[PDB]
Structures are given as structure tokens and as C-alpha cells.
Copies of this chain bind each other. A is one copy, B any other.
Amino acid sequence: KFAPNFVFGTATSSYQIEGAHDEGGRTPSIWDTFCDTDGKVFEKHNGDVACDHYHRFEEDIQHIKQLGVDTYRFSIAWPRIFPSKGQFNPEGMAFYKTLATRLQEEGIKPAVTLYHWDLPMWAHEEGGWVNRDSVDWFLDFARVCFEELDGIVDSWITHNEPWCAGFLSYHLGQHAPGHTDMNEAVRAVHHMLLSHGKAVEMLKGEFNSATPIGITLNLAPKYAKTDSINDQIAMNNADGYANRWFLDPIFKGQYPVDMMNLFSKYVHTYDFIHAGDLATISTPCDFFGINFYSRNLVEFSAASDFLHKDAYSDYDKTGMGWDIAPSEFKDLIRRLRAEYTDLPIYITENGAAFDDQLVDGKIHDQNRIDYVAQHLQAVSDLNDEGMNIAGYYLWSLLDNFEWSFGYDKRFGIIYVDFDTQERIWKDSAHWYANVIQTHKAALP
């Protein structure tokens, strides 16, 4: 059961679906160059064509309208809007203005993500997010988006998963630009978080707008394999690296000193945190976005710099090898209310990848239906406790370019044949439409 004001939704990002990579004045992003770099992405796959959504946006709007979702979440491609530094590209902005206007016409609330990892190559070449100037480049991008789209757009999300864009990209080398440097990584994270707060301030101050704005963090709760002191330190450090490094500056206006000390094996000055920065980072928002996928069971490692490694999990697992963990999702939400925030929470991404077999114009993904149903049940149980999860966005609308895995993994509720660009609904899409329908059918 869900409340009458509960928002069902689905979501995508620009580089994962759009394609048309050198069309409409678009110039290359870090992910274009990363896909072309040897050994970084699965079988050299890229987002040149992707789901061809830039051309086929109208067909996909109908699919969204057919699902009956209250809200559609999408991201704006920075390299379409500012293909060069200081050079606005109005053709790029028109596409999004048309996309948002068409969604509104169809009774669909547009929820817009400003940054979903597609940094322009001109920005990267000046240091990217490692450079403090990146705060001001992003503000020019945001200003132009607010000025042209704030009358149409229903909600703004400044940043999607700064852990991925920051740590996974600059420390672990898995995402673009694929660096392995903790110093660059903490500087990148700080400038993303600061750009978040400057953008919120700009919307509410300069533009005098009451459009709901917030951030989205990916959160993965961390559990100790045993109750030994070592394994408690492992959990703590994993929690701090994945969660508290981002939650503390956003809601407390401080970085966790335990992680600062732990990172001091690589980071030997924090003078990049200027005075006034953490107050701006912690500027009050209208909601809090959460991307949730799984937990991580950890144990202690004497040979790890950050004192933790992954432990063996006996849980049921997705196609990615990630734990299916709705009980731990409930722990996470409870903790955020206890420790961090009383803001309305939106689950801005939840979903799963399974080995989907297309067989005779049909995809039987009972496993994806299970996953989503367990989490929606966990959302309903939490709302009965008073945890205030106002909405939920199913990731993803269609099968799309899944980053370093390429098209090898399929997260979509709608199947996509990538050589014909045919959309075929999966059983989970039918099920999800009917969940929204059955919900809507009983409400006033």
C-alpha cells in the first residue's frame, strides 16, 4: 500500500541512452575518450549510437506515458549545452526544452539531473573536477539550464552519485577519466559537492525559485563479517569511504576526521577546503535523493591501506554479483532519519541487472520482478513507520550503455535490440505499469 501523494517513476541518463554523439553541436565528453581507451570499457563499447534516444525521443515518451509513471527522470548532457568553454549551444538546449515541454503536455513531471558524469573534454583538459575552476564552469552550465528550463521542470537534481564520479573515477580508475590518485579524488569530490551548494544557492537566491532542488548520493550500507574489533574498523572505514564522506559534508557541514586521517596516507594537505565551503555544501535542500542497489559485507585486511576487503556473501545475487538486500535498505533509511536528515526521501534509482534472454519477441525476467517487488514492499513498510519516502524511480526505463560493462549488462524494464533499435517491453515493465495502475485504481 502507498499514500496518495507517493510518486512512482522511472529514470535514465543522457550518455547511456541519447547517442547522436557528434550531432546537434555536441563535442566529446570524458566518457567518449574513455570508451576509446584500451581496456577501460567492455569490448570497446561506446555511447555513439546507444539507444538512439536523441532521434527517437518521441517513441520513448509514448512508452513512458504507457507505463503511467508520475515522473520521468533524465539528465542533461553538458557537452551539448557548452560544447566549448564559454560558448552556449542553443540547438542543444532546444532538445531538452522540447523534451521537457512534451513530457508536461503528456501529464508527466520532468525530474532533471544536471550532472550524470558526462564532463566535457575541454573541462578535463584544464584538470577537470580536480581544478577548483570546475565549480564556476558547472555554475555557468547550471545557470543556463535554470534560466531556460525552470518554468517547465518539476524538480532539479544537481549531482548524481559523486562517489562514482569522484572516487570510482579518480581513485579506483574504473570510471572516466580513469585516474588512480586519492589526492585528485578528494579534490574532485569536494568541487562537485561545492558546485552542488553553489547551484542550490543560485536557484533560491538569484532566480528566486521555489522549484524543489537536491542531491542524489549512492549509498551502500556496510556490515561486519564478525563482531571482532578489526571487523568493526573495517565496517567503519568502508562506511566512511562509501557513505559518510558524502553525508557528513551535505548534512553536518564537516568531513569525518577518521576518514581524513585514514586518507592521510595519500592526502597530505586539506587546504583545498577553503573557509566558507562546507557551509555552502550544507545549504538546505528540499529533498534528499538516494540511489540504492545493495549492501557490502566486509572484513578486516592488514594489507589494505583502508583496512577492509570484501567478505564472502551467502545472499541471493543479481546478474552483477551484487547482493539482493531489502532488509539492509530498511536499516539504511532508519539510520538516515536517526543521524542525518528529516527531509523527504526519493529513491532516485533502484533496480537490477539479470541475464535477460530474448526468446521469440519476449523476455521473461521474473528475477527483476522479484527484486523490485521486495524493495517496494520495504518502502511501504518503512512509510508505515513514518520514514517519509515520498517517491521511487525504477532504474532503468530501457536497456542502455552500462558504463564500464557496456551493453553486456541490461538494467532496463524495456528491452532494446541495439542493432535494430526496436523497443520490446519486458515482463517487469508490464508488471510495473500494473503496480502503478493497481495503486492509482484504488486511490481517490
Contact = CB atoms under 8 A, between A and B. Distances in A.
Interface of A: 37-40, 171-173, 180-185, 227-230, 233, 236-237, 256-262, 264-266, 268-271, 273, 275, 300-305, 307, 309, 311-314
A181 B303 contact: yes
A261 B307 contact: yes
B312 A264 contact: no
A229 B184 CA distance: 18
Contacts of A307: 261, 264
B275 A257 contact: no
Top 8 A-B pairs, shortest CB-CB distance: A39-B312, A258-B258, A261-B262, A180-B303, A268-B302, A181-B302, A38-B312, A180-B301
B229 A270 contact: yes
Nearest to A310: B39
Number of copies: 4
B266 A264 contact: no
Contacts of A230: 269-271
Contacts of A237: 261
A227 B275 contact: yes
Contacts of A259: 261
Contacts of A301: 173, 180-181
Contact of A314 (B38, B184, B270, B314): B38
Given A261-B237, A302-B180, A302-B182, A228 B275 contact: yes
A416 B258 CA distance: 48
A74 B269 CA distance: 39
A270 to B, nearest CB: 5
Nearest to A261: B262
A304 B233 contact: no
Nearest to A277: B229
A302 B261 contact: no
A38 B314 CA distance: 8
Nearest to A184: B302
A262 B264 CA distance: 8
Given A229-B270, A268-B183, A171 B303 contact: yes
Contacts of A303: 171-173, 180-182, 185, 266, 268
